Amino acid sequence: EPLTIEGNRFVTLCIMIRTTPWEVSRDVKLHPRDEVDWHTLEGVRALREAFATNNPNGRLTWGFTMNALEDGRKNYREIRDYVVECQKKYGDEVTYFPGYFPAMYLPRERVNREMSEAIEIISKMVGNGYRPQSIMGGFLSADNLRYLAEKENIHVAHAVIWSQHNGGGADGSPSYPFYPSTEHFCKPAQGKSDFIDCVNLDGWTMDFICARRSGQTGHGIDGYNSRRGVGPIETYKGWGLDLGHREVMHTEAIHFDKGLELNGFGWVANIWEAQMVHEFGKDLICDAMKMWVTGTKERWPDTHFVTFGEFGELWRKQYKSNDDWNYRFVERGSGLGDSYNNLEIKWFMNKEFRLALLRDWHTKNSPAYVIDFTRYDLQAHEPADPSPEKPAKDWSLINKINQKALRPQDKPVLIDKLEKEDQDLIRKYYPELL
């Protein structure tokens, strides 16, 4: 259970296991920190036990870097054995997590080859023909997703780091699930000719108000941070448990209150790195995990905590093309930190475009402004194959207006200031906005 996406609320958690922070391949370690001692059996077990609190049917995705899969040292061996026990006991997923940024630094063919190598290691590790239902890719290319679907018969991937701009750029996509185009991993396939049968999933649910920004001042409640939402770094850790928890609940409520009404289901994604227990303390991080799960179940008791792969396949069972979905969200700020209370944001996402409107609702009769209008019907292109000494860090899909507001043309404007053709495309889907 559950057998269908419709009417249901889902949380998909992944716990990441690694030897260094940003190891996209065996020899390509983009961050110098040696985390061997930050990964222990007791730390991993404690975090899983925290997750199970008030959550006996919950399962999650364990994601390993290549070096964590292959390391022969006792800690990594013990962690792998425990994770196999979890696959058997809980139905947790076990899959590859290539260091967040693989497509930025590695040629497409290399990513594909190494994904296949990891899948083989994992199948043999878990035994009895096990294959994961997803890959925890982060920056994958369209070709990597094609390859997974067609050559590995894997039809879900985390390959959306939704809104990320400055860890590189991958802004422009929908934040909810879609089938990507052969043109660009952030672009919904427009039809049969560019279709890839792989569901592309976000990794961390954002507070949409926070995520409008590029970059950050820090992790605290005094600052702003474009990665604030359900992720623990910018909430439980940066703000402390009490205040952090409130922002995580608020962000979930975007999906589990109004979102479910608008979209027919609600889905929250999150990724917690196992090394956080060492970096920040076992009790703090385990208390945060317990608080998150318990608080979610208290408010939304029928929420299903399932693997990334299970959720993607539930979506794929219901939605067969990008004509089948049309996502809407509405959010006002929480009133905590940079989730500014005076702002109301509305997102619209469909096969042909996404659109965001922002309004200062504290000012009587202040209109909503377009802060993002990104067309998908336009041809898109990804960077040419990079390599580790010539990375391609900017994979964003940007054309008319982008929320990060880094170009003069990104100035927020009334919807009636858009070009006629852009209005016409909008009116096709949402005539009420014009």
mmCIF file of N, CA and C in Angstrom, residues 242-360:
data_model
loop_
_atom_site.group_PDB
_atom_site.id
_atom_site.type_symbol
_atom_site.label_atom_id
_atom_site.label_comp_id
_atom_site.label_asym_id
_atom_site.label_seq_id
_atom_site.Cartn_x
_atom_site.Cartn_y
_atom_site.Cartn_z
ATOM 1 N N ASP A 242 12.878 24.161 17.077
ATOM 2 C CA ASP A 242 11.545 24.716 17.294
ATOM 3 C C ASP A 242 11.071 25.536 16.096
ATOM 4 N N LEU A 243 11.888 26.486 15.681
ATOM 5 C CA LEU A 243 11.535 27.359 14.570
ATOM 6 C C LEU A 243 11.691 26.648 13.233
ATOM 7 N N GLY A 244 12.754 25.869 13.098
ATOM 8 C CA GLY A 244 12.951 25.092 11.880
ATOM 9 C C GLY A 244 11.774 24.198 11.560
ATOM 10 N N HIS A 245 11.275 23.511 12.581
ATOM 11 C CA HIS A 245 10.149 22.623 12.397
ATOM 12 C C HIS A 245 8.938 23.341 11.794
ATOM 13 N N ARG A 246 8.676 24.555 12.278
ATOM 14 C CA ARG A 246 7.536 25.310 11.805
ATOM 15 C C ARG A 246 7.665 25.608 10.304
ATOM 16 N N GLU A 247 8.872 25.928 9.837
ATOM 17 C CA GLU A 247 9.069 26.203 8.409
ATOM 18 C C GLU A 247 8.902 24.928 7.568
ATOM 19 N N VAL A 248 9.384 23.795 8.087
ATOM 20 C CA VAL A 248 9.209 22.505 7.393
ATOM 21 C C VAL A 248 7.724 22.146 7.288
ATOM 22 N N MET A 249 6.973 22.320 8.374
ATOM 23 C CA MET A 249 5.524 22.056 8.322
ATOM 24 C C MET A 249 4.827 22.976 7.344
ATOM 25 N N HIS A 250 5.185 24.264 7.358
ATOM 26 C CA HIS A 250 4.602 25.232 6.441
ATOM 27 C C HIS A 250 4.833 24.818 4.986
ATOM 28 N N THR A 251 6.073 24.423 4.691
ATOM 29 C CA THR A 251 6.419 24.029 3.337
ATOM 30 C C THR A 251 5.662 22.782 2.937
ATOM 31 N N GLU A 252 5.556 21.816 3.847
ATOM 32 C CA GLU A 252 4.741 20.638 3.531
ATOM 33 C C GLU A 252 3.291 20.981 3.286
ATOM 34 N N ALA A 253 2.763 21.967 4.023
ATOM 35 C CA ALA A 253 1.354 22.335 3.888
ATOM 36 C C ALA A 253 1.020 22.920 2.502
ATOM 37 N N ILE A 254 2.006 23.487 1.810
ATOM 38 C CA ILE A 254 1.805 23.910 0.429
ATOM 39 C C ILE A 254 1.257 22.752 -0.408
ATOM 40 N N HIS A 255 1.765 21.559 -0.111
ATOM 41 C CA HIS A 255 1.453 20.332 -0.827
ATOM 42 C C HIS A 255 0.318 19.535 -0.230
ATOM 43 N N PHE A 256 0.299 19.454 1.088
ATOM 44 C CA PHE A 256 -0.630 18.548 1.776
ATOM 45 C C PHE A 256 -1.954 19.192 2.178
ATOM 46 N N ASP A 257 -2.044 20.521 2.107
ATOM 47 C CA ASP A 257 -3.321 21.226 2.276
ATOM 48 C C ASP A 257 -3.817 21.655 0.888
ATOM 49 N N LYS A 258 -3.472 22.848 0.434
ATOM 50 C CA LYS A 258 -3.990 23.386 -0.829
ATOM 51 C C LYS A 258 -3.534 22.584 -2.047
ATOM 52 N N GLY A 259 -2.275 22.153 -2.054
ATOM 53 C CA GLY A 259 -1.773 21.443 -3.232
ATOM 54 C C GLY A 259 -2.598 20.221 -3.599
ATOM 55 N N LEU A 260 -2.914 19.414 -2.595
ATOM 56 C CA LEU A 260 -3.684 18.202 -2.848
ATOM 57 C C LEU A 260 -5.059 18.545 -3.430
ATOM 58 N N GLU A 261 -5.649 19.626 -2.954
ATOM 59 C CA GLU A 261 -6.928 20.078 -3.511
ATOM 60 C C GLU A 261 -6.800 20.502 -4.966
ATOM 61 N N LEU A 262 -5.711 21.198 -5.297
ATOM 62 C CA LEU A 262 -5.514 21.686 -6.658
ATOM 63 C C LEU A 262 -5.086 20.598 -7.641
ATOM 64 N N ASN A 263 -4.273 19.673 -7.155
ATOM 65 C CA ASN A 263 -3.557 18.744 -8.053
ATOM 66 C C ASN A 263 -4.022 17.305 -7.987
ATOM 67 N N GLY A 264 -4.762 16.964 -6.948
ATOM 68 C CA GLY A 264 -5.274 15.620 -6.783
ATOM 69 C C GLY A 264 -4.399 14.699 -5.954
ATOM 70 N N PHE A 265 -3.163 15.106 -5.682
ATOM 71 C CA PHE A 265 -2.277 14.375 -4.776
ATOM 72 C C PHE A 265 -1.329 15.426 -4.206
ATOM 73 N N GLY A 266 -0.591 15.048 -3.160
ATOM 74 C CA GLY A 266 0.473 15.911 -2.638
ATOM 75 C C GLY A 266 1.733 15.100 -2.472
ATOM 76 N N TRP A 267 2.879 15.724 -2.738
ATOM 77 C CA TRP A 267 4.162 15.037 -2.669
ATOM 78 C C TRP A 267 5.244 15.981 -2.155
ATOM 79 N N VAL A 268 5.955 15.524 -1.136
ATOM 80 C CA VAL A 268 7.098 16.183 -0.556
ATOM 81 C C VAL A 268 8.304 15.264 -0.739
ATOM 82 N N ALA A 269 9.413 15.855 -1.195
ATOM 83 C CA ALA A 269 10.692 15.171 -1.393
ATOM 84 C C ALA A 269 11.729 15.683 -0.428
ATOM 85 N N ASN A 270 12.599 14.816 0.077
ATOM 86 C CA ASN A 270 13.665 15.299 0.960
ATOM 87 C C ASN A 270 14.851 14.363 0.883
ATOM 88 N N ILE A 271 16.030 14.934 1.101
ATOM 89 C CA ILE A 271 17.311 14.209 1.085
ATOM 90 C C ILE A 271 18.075 14.631 2.329
ATOM 91 N N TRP A 272 18.425 13.677 3.168
ATOM 92 C CA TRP A 272 19.238 13.880 4.370
ATOM 93 C C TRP A 272 20.528 13.103 4.214
ATOM 94 N N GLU A 273 21.661 13.770 4.302
ATOM 95 C CA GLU A 273 22.927 13.075 4.222
ATOM 96 C C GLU A 273 23.261 12.443 5.566
ATOM 97 N N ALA A 274 23.634 11.167 5.527
ATOM 98 C CA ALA A 274 23.974 10.427 6.750
ATOM 99 C C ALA A 274 25.051 11.147 7.563
ATOM 100 N N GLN A 275 25.994 11.780 6.882
ATOM 101 C CA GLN A 275 27.098 12.452 7.567
ATOM 102 C C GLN A 275 26.644 13.593 8.471
ATOM 103 N N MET A 276 25.384 14.015 8.370
ATOM 104 C CA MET A 276 24.896 15.106 9.229
ATOM 105 C C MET A 276 24.956 14.734 10.692
ATOM 106 N N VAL A 277 24.802 13.454 11.001
ATOM 107 C CA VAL A 277 24.886 12.980 12.402
ATOM 108 C C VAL A 277 26.261 13.342 12.974
ATOM 109 N N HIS A 278 27.309 13.132 12.191
ATOM 110 C CA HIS A 278 28.672 13.488 12.626
ATOM 111 C C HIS A 278 28.896 15.003 12.609
ATOM 112 N N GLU A 279 28.424 15.682 11.571
ATOM 113 C CA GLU A 279 28.707 17.117 11.432
ATOM 114 C C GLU A 279 28.028 17.950 12.523
ATOM 115 N N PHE A 280 26.810 17.571 12.885
ATOM 116 C CA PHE A 280 25.951 18.392 13.752
ATOM 117 C C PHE A 280 25.555 17.771 15.069
ATOM 118 N N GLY A 281 25.780 16.486 15.233
ATOM 119 C CA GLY A 281 25.507 15.765 16.459
ATOM 120 C C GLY A 281 24.373 14.778 16.279
ATOM 121 N N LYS A 282 24.520 13.596 16.858
ATOM 122 C CA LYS A 282 23.557 12.541 16.676
ATOM 123 C C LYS A 282 22.201 12.899 17.280
ATOM 124 N N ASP A 283 22.184 13.462 18.492
ATOM 125 C CA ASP A 283 20.901 13.732 19.112
ATOM 126 C C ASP A 283 20.138 14.824 18.402
ATOM 127 N N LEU A 284 20.813 15.903 18.030
ATOM 128 C CA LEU A 284 20.170 16.983 17.287
ATOM 129 C C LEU A 284 19.540 16.472 15.988
ATOM 130 N N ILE A 285 20.298 15.734 15.177
ATOM 131 C CA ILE A 285 19.821 15.323 13.864
ATOM 132 C C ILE A 285 18.754 14.238 13.995
ATOM 133 N N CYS A 286 18.950 13.297 14.903
ATOM 134 C CA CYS A 286 17.898 12.309 15.144
ATOM 135 C C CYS A 286 16.633 12.926 15.735
ATOM 136 N N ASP A 287 16.765 13.894 16.647
ATOM 137 C CA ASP A 287 15.582 14.601 17.141
ATOM 138 C C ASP A 287 14.866 15.344 16.008
ATOM 139 N N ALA A 288 15.620 15.963 15.112
ATOM 140 C CA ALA A 288 15.020 16.646 13.983
ATOM 141 C C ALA A 288 14.249 15.674 13.089
ATOM 142 N N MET A 289 14.844 14.507 12.826
ATOM 143 C CA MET A 289 14.177 13.503 11.988
ATOM 144 C C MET A 289 12.891 13.037 12.644
ATOM 145 N N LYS A 290 12.944 12.714 13.938
ATOM 146 C CA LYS A 290 11.759 12.292 14.677
ATOM 147 C C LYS A 290 10.675 13.375 14.631
ATOM 148 N N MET A 291 11.077 14.630 14.807
ATOM 149 C CA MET A 291 10.142 15.726 14.839
ATOM 150 C C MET A 291 9.429 15.876 13.479
ATOM 151 N N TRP A 292 10.233 15.825 12.416
ATOM 152 C CA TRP A 292 9.735 15.946 11.078
ATOM 153 C C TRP A 292 8.696 14.866 10.779
ATOM 154 N N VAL A 293 9.059 13.608 10.999
ATOM 155 C CA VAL A 293 8.148 12.500 10.681
ATOM 156 C C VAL A 293 6.928 12.536 11.579
ATOM 157 N N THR A 294 7.133 12.677 12.880
ATOM 158 C CA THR A 294 6.024 12.689 13.820
ATOM 159 C C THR A 294 5.072 13.849 13.561
ATOM 160 N N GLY A 295 5.620 15.022 13.259
ATOM 161 C CA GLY A 295 4.798 16.186 13.018
ATOM 162 C C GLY A 295 3.967 16.069 11.741
ATOM 163 N N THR A 296 4.582 15.472 10.716
ATOM 164 C CA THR A 296 3.885 15.192 9.471
ATOM 165 C C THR A 296 2.735 14.221 9.707
ATOM 166 N N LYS A 297 3.000 13.123 10.405
ATOM 167 C CA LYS A 297 1.957 12.115 10.664
ATOM 168 C C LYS A 297 0.858 12.644 11.587
ATOM 169 N N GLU A 298 1.201 13.526 12.507
ATOM 170 C CA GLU A 298 0.195 14.080 13.398
ATOM 171 C C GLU A 298 -0.819 14.916 12.625
ATOM 172 N N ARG A 299 -0.330 15.748 11.711
ATOM 173 C CA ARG A 299 -1.190 16.674 10.990
ATOM 174 C C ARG A 299 -1.884 16.032 9.794
ATOM 175 N N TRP A 300 -1.188 15.105 9.137
ATOM 176 C CA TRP A 300 -1.659 14.426 7.936
ATOM 177 C C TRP A 300 -1.474 12.918 8.135
ATOM 178 N N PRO A 301 -2.373 12.296 8.911
ATOM 179 C CA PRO A 301 -2.128 10.931 9.385
ATOM 180 C C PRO A 301 -2.073 9.850 8.341
ATOM 181 N N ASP A 302 -2.640 10.098 7.159
ATOM 182 C CA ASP A 302 -2.601 9.069 6.123
ATOM 183 C C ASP A 302 -1.437 9.255 5.140
ATOM 184 N N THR A 303 -0.527 10.180 5.431
ATOM 185 C CA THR A 303 0.652 10.361 4.582
ATOM 186 C C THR A 303 1.439 9.074 4.464
ATOM 187 N N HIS A 304 1.835 8.725 3.240
ATOM 188 C CA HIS A 304 2.639 7.547 2.964
ATOM 189 C C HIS A 304 4.090 7.953 2.791
ATOM 190 N N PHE A 305 4.973 7.384 3.605
ATOM 191 C CA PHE A 305 6.403 7.551 3.485
ATOM 192 C C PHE A 305 6.905 6.376 2.645
ATOM 193 N N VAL A 306 7.256 6.692 1.401
ATOM 194 C CA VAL A 306 7.612 5.671 0.403
ATOM 195 C C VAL A 306 8.929 6.027 -0.265
ATOM 196 N N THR A 307 9.479 5.065 -0.996
ATOM 197 C CA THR A 307 10.736 5.292 -1.683
ATOM 198 C C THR A 307 10.553 6.231 -2.886
ATOM 199 N N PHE A 308 11.631 6.900 -3.308
ATOM 200 C CA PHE A 308 11.580 7.705 -4.541
ATOM 201 C C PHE A 308 11.075 6.880 -5.696
ATOM 202 N N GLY A 309 11.640 5.680 -5.874
ATOM 203 C CA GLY A 309 11.258 4.831 -6.976
ATOM 204 C C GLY A 309 9.793 4.421 -6.925
ATOM 205 N N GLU A 310 9.285 4.076 -5.742
ATOM 206 C CA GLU A 310 7.868 3.651 -5.605
ATOM 207 C C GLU A 310 6.955 4.798 -5.995
ATOM 208 N N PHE A 311 7.256 5.996 -5.504
ATOM 209 C CA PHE A 311 6.424 7.146 -5.798
ATOM 210 C C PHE A 311 6.443 7.443 -7.293
ATOM 211 N N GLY A 312 7.620 7.460 -7.905
ATOM 212 C CA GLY A 312 7.693 7.714 -9.348
ATOM 213 C C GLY A 312 6.885 6.713 -10.141
ATOM 214 N N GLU A 313 6.918 5.445 -9.735
ATOM 215 C CA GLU A 313 6.127 4.438 -10.455
ATOM 216 C C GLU A 313 4.644 4.587 -10.174
ATOM 217 N N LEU A 314 4.245 5.045 -8.977
ATOM 218 C CA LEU A 314 2.827 5.376 -8.772
ATOM 219 C C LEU A 314 2.376 6.488 -9.712
ATOM 220 N N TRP A 315 3.215 7.500 -9.895
ATOM 221 C CA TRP A 315 2.899 8.596 -10.799
ATOM 222 C C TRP A 315 2.785 8.086 -12.241
ATOM 223 N N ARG A 316 3.745 7.281 -12.651
ATOM 224 C CA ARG A 316 3.813 6.730 -14.009
ATOM 225 C C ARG A 316 2.633 5.804 -14.305
ATOM 226 N N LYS A 317 2.088 5.166 -13.281
ATOM 227 C CA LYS A 317 0.910 4.324 -13.464
ATOM 228 C C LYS A 317 -0.317 5.150 -13.871
ATOM 229 N N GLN A 318 -0.402 6.368 -13.360
ATOM 230 C CA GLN A 318 -1.564 7.239 -13.574
ATOM 231 C C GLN A 318 -1.394 8.185 -14.765
ATOM 232 N N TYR A 319 -0.194 8.722 -14.945
ATOM 233 C CA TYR A 319 0.074 9.759 -15.932
ATOM 234 C C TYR A 319 0.949 9.168 -17.012
ATOM 235 N N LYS A 320 0.450 9.154 -18.246
ATOM 236 C CA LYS A 320 1.128 8.485 -19.344
ATOM 237 C C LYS A 320 1.783 9.408 -20.362
ATOM 238 N N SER A 321 1.436 10.688 -20.326
ATOM 239 C CA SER A 321 2.097 11.710 -21.165
ATOM 240 C C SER A 321 2.023 13.010 -20.413
ATOM 241 N N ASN A 322 2.682 14.033 -20.926
ATOM 242 C CA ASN A 322 2.616 15.317 -20.280
ATOM 243 C C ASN A 322 1.357 16.096 -20.581
ATOM 244 N N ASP A 323 0.454 15.514 -21.363
ATOM 245 C CA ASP A 323 -0.871 16.100 -21.514
ATOM 246 C C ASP A 323 -1.764 15.802 -20.315
ATOM 247 N N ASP A 324 -1.349 14.868 -19.468
ATOM 248 C CA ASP A 324 -2.199 14.327 -18.416
ATOM 249 C C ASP A 324 -2.122 15.104 -17.098
ATOM 250 N N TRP A 325 -1.175 16.036 -16.977
ATOM 251 C CA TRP A 325 -1.001 16.793 -15.744
ATOM 252 C C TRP A 325 -1.001 18.292 -15.983
ATOM 253 N N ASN A 326 -1.339 19.021 -14.929
ATOM 254 C CA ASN A 326 -1.406 20.464 -14.955
ATOM 255 C C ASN A 326 -1.366 20.858 -13.486
ATOM 256 N N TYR A 327 -0.234 21.385 -13.024
ATOM 257 C CA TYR A 327 -0.022 21.627 -11.602
ATOM 258 C C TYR A 327 -0.185 23.094 -11.223
ATOM 259 N N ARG A 328 -0.805 23.302 -10.076
ATOM 260 C CA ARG A 328 -1.001 24.627 -9.505
ATOM 261 C C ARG A 328 -0.640 24.590 -8.029
ATOM 262 N N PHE A 329 -0.021 25.680 -7.569
ATOM 263 C CA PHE A 329 0.263 25.907 -6.165
ATOM 264 C C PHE A 329 -0.041 27.331 -5.782
ATOM 265 N N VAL A 330 -0.453 27.514 -4.537
ATOM 266 C CA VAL A 330 -0.642 28.840 -3.936
ATOM 267 C C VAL A 330 0.023 28.831 -2.568
ATOM 268 N N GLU A 331 0.805 29.858 -2.263
ATOM 269 C CA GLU A 331 1.469 29.951 -0.962
ATOM 270 C C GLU A 331 1.548 31.379 -0.504
ATOM 271 N N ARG A 332 1.262 31.604 0.771
ATOM 272 C CA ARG A 332 1.656 32.840 1.449
ATOM 273 C C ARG A 332 2.826 32.559 2.370
ATOM 274 N N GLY A 333 3.644 33.567 2.650
ATOM 275 C CA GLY A 333 4.819 33.333 3.486
ATOM 276 C C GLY A 333 4.436 32.847 4.870
ATOM 277 N N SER A 334 5.303 32.047 5.479
ATOM 278 C CA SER A 334 5.065 31.565 6.829
ATOM 279 C C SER A 334 5.147 32.661 7.863
ATOM 280 N N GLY A 335 5.824 33.756 7.535
ATOM 281 C CA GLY A 335 6.144 34.731 8.555
ATOM 282 C C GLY A 335 7.391 34.441 9.361
ATOM 283 N N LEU A 336 8.154 33.433 8.959
ATOM 284 C CA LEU A 336 9.412 33.105 9.577
ATOM 285 C C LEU A 336 10.544 33.307 8.579
ATOM 286 N N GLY A 337 11.605 33.975 9.037
ATOM 287 C CA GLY A 337 12.801 34.156 8.203
ATOM 288 C C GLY A 337 12.490 34.834 6.888
ATOM 289 N N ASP A 338 12.999 34.291 5.803
ATOM 290 C CA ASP A 338 12.770 34.872 4.490
ATOM 291 C C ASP A 338 11.503 34.376 3.787
ATOM 292 N N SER A 339 10.637 33.646 4.496
ATOM 293 C CA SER A 339 9.318 33.289 3.955
ATOM 294 C C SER A 339 8.358 34.444 4.312
ATOM 295 N N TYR A 340 8.502 35.535 3.574
ATOM 296 C CA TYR A 340 7.905 36.823 3.946
ATOM 297 C C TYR A 340 6.395 36.775 3.923
ATOM 298 N N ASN A 341 5.793 37.246 5.015
ATOM 299 C CA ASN A 341 4.362 37.085 5.212
ATOM 300 C C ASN A 341 3.486 37.883 4.259
ATOM 301 N N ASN A 342 4.016 38.973 3.718
ATOM 302 C CA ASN A 342 3.249 39.862 2.888
ATOM 303 C C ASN A 342 3.128 39.370 1.455
ATOM 304 N N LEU A 343 3.811 38.269 1.136
ATOM 305 C CA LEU A 343 3.829 37.759 -0.235
ATOM 306 C C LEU A 343 2.893 36.583 -0.445
ATOM 307 N N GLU A 344 2.190 36.596 -1.584
ATOM 308 C CA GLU A 344 1.404 35.481 -2.055
ATOM 309 C C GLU A 344 1.953 35.098 -3.416
ATOM 310 N N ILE A 345 2.374 33.834 -3.554
ATOM 311 C CA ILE A 345 2.895 33.331 -4.824
ATOM 312 C C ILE A 345 1.953 32.289 -5.384
ATOM 313 N N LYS A 346 1.738 32.323 -6.697
ATOM 314 C CA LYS A 346 0.981 31.314 -7.384
ATOM 315 C C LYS A 346 1.861 30.750 -8.492
ATOM 316 N N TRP A 347 1.995 29.425 -8.537
ATOM 317 C CA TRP A 347 2.696 28.729 -9.628
ATOM 318 C C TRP A 347 1.704 27.944 -10.468
ATOM 319 N N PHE A 348 1.954 27.925 -11.774
ATOM 320 C CA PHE A 348 1.218 27.163 -12.774
ATOM 321 C C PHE A 348 2.251 26.421 -13.602
ATOM 322 N N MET A 349 2.085 25.122 -13.760
ATOM 323 C CA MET A 349 3.039 24.317 -14.508
ATOM 324 C C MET A 349 2.296 23.324 -15.388
ATOM 325 N N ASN A 350 2.601 23.368 -16.674
ATOM 326 C CA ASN A 350 1.982 22.441 -17.621
ATOM 327 C C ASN A 350 3.027 22.046 -18.686
ATOM 328 N N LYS A 351 2.634 21.220 -19.649
ATOM 329 C CA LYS A 351 3.576 20.728 -20.654
ATOM 330 C C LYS A 351 4.261 21.857 -21.421
ATOM 331 N N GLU A 352 3.532 22.952 -21.635
ATOM 332 C CA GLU A 352 3.999 24.000 -22.528
ATOM 333 C C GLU A 352 4.673 25.195 -21.862
ATOM 334 N N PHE A 353 4.439 25.414 -20.567
ATOM 335 C CA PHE A 353 5.125 26.482 -19.843
ATOM 336 C C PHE A 353 4.956 26.330 -18.335
ATOM 337 N N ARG A 354 5.810 27.048 -17.613
ATOM 338 C CA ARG A 354 5.496 27.380 -16.228
ATOM 339 C C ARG A 354 5.362 28.880 -16.096
ATOM 340 N N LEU A 355 4.610 29.273 -15.083
ATOM 341 C CA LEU A 355 4.272 30.662 -14.820
ATOM 342 C C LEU A 355 4.152 30.869 -13.316
ATOM 343 N N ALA A 356 4.801 31.924 -12.813
ATOM 344 C CA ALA A 356 4.651 32.346 -11.409
ATOM 345 C C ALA A 356 4.182 33.790 -11.320
ATOM 346 N N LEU A 357 3.197 34.016 -10.457
ATOM 347 C CA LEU A 357 2.663 35.335 -10.174
ATOM 348 C C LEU A 357 2.941 35.628 -8.695
ATOM 349 N N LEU A 358 3.347 36.852 -8.396
ATOM 350 C CA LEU A 358 3.688 37.260 -7.030
ATOM 351 C C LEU A 358 2.934 38.534 -6.709
ATOM 352 N N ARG A 359 2.382 38.593 -5.498
ATOM 353 C CA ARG A 359 1.544 39.728 -5.074
ATOM 354 C C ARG A 359 1.869 40.108 -3.632
ATOM 355 N N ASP A 360 1.968 41.408 -3.368
ATOM 356 C CA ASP A 360 2.104 41.968 -2.026
ATOM 357 C C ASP A 360 0.686 42.147 -1.533
#
